[PDB]
């Protein structure tokens, strides 16, 4: 097997201890949560942190899934399994259950964490898209203190977040609105494979019109500007098939997929459209049920 290069290990006994470790240890220290993104990278020697701050002991303090009437709070240490299994979360943010069911496999879900997926900030991965669709607010904490980063702000680039080296994602806060639902649809070559292309949608319905909408695309290099333009265009439209089709066309235009082993760019664009339509329809049906 490919194995990691040498590094030093630290076990954070609390969030403040973890943040202090990152501050003292420095840029070359990295948090390890589930390790299902970091550890494969280090085994491949793509990632070579000098230090790992294991925050698995924070799984209780930060591993919560809390659904308040206006706010879903999901701890960074929340296992994908916990997010997938949270029936109240599924009632409020079904997108999470959709993505989780098609993320990795059950064993990976037992370890991988929402915080780990988000901070990995892999554009080919599903939770960053889900948390972007739901307008999530990441709650970072560092030696300076605690602060809130919008998901769009948090996701500053491929594999890059707004988090400083000495800062740790603590929880992700997702606003809940009435008459709102969400869905995620992913096309993968195989179960557990990363998305050939995935789309997610969160819609708000006032009667039959759309009050608010967000569409996210995974693995297709979405343009946030174009996705926001599509979402704004969805406002006030009926929750019908014509609206979904127009949104799918916009989503086709809103991404720059690359032909690779996962499929042709044209197929990725077709999937952008079809999965956008499917997720929009599913989110609407979920609002209406």
């Amino acid at each position: 097997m490919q194995v990691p290069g040498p590094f030093e290990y630290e076990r954070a006994t609390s969030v403040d201890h973890a943040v202090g470790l990152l501050d003292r240890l420095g840029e070359d220290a990295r948090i390890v949560a589930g390790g299902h993104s970091l550890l494969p990278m280090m085994k491949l020697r793509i990632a070579n942190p000098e230090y790992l701050v294991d925050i698995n002991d924070l799984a209780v303090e930060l591993g919560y899934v809390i659904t308040d009437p206006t706010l879903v709070r999901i701890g960074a240490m929340a296992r994908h399994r916990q997010v997938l299994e949270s029936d109240p979360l599924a009632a409020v943010c079904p997108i999470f259950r959709d993505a989780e069911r098609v993320i990795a496999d059950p064993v990976v879900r037992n370890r991988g964490t929402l915080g780990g997926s988000l901070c990995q900030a892999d554009p080919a991965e599903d939770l960053t898209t889900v948390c972007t669709i739901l307008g999530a607010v990441c709650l970072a904490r560092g030696p300076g203190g605690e602060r809130e980063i919008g998901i769009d702000d948090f996701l500053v680039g491929p594999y890059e977040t707004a988090l400083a080296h000495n800062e740790m994602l603590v929880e992700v806060r997702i606003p809940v609105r009435h008459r709102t639902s969400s869905a995620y649809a992913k096309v993968e070559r195989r179960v557990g494979d990363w998305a050939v292309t995935a789309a997610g949608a969160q819609v708000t319905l006032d009667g039959d019109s759309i009050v608010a909408a967000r569409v996210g695309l995974t693995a297709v290099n979405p343009d946030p500007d174009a996705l926001r333009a599509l979402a704004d265009d969805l406002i006030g439209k009926p929750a019908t098939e014509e609206t979904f089709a127009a949104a799918g066309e916009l989503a086709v235009q809103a991404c720059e997929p690359v032909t690779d082993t996962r499929g042709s760019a044209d197929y990725k664009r077709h999937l952008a459209r079809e999965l956008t339509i499917r997720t929009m329809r599913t989110a609407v049906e979920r609002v209406r049920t």
């Binding site: 096309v187 070559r189 050939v196 499929g263 042709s264 044209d266 197929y267 999937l271």
Partner: peptide, 13 residues
């Protein structure tokens, strides 16, 4: 083969 989703869709096209 492989009849991946993309290759099957391209065949459809």
């Amino acid at each position: 083969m492989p009849l991946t989703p993309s290759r099957v869709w391209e065949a459809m096209q």
